[PDB]
Structures are given as structure tokens and as C-alpha cells.
Amino acid sequence: TRICCGCYWNGSKDVCSQSCC
């Protein structure tokens, strides 16, 4: 869901964001 910063594959698509920043 919130896998750190960068881009991760959350289920349906690559979700890039700033989780751990």
C-alpha cells in the first residue's frame, strides 16, 4: 500500500509516491 518512496506494484498498477519521506 505505502511501500516506501519510489514506485511499487500495489495490486493493479505501479504506484509511485513518497511513503517513507
CB 8 within 8 A of CB 14: yes
| Cβ neighbours of residue 12 closer than 8 Å, sequence gap 6 or more | none
Amino acid identity of residue 11, one-letter, is G
Dist. CA 17–CA 2, nearest whole Å: 8
CB 6 within 8 A of CB 20: no
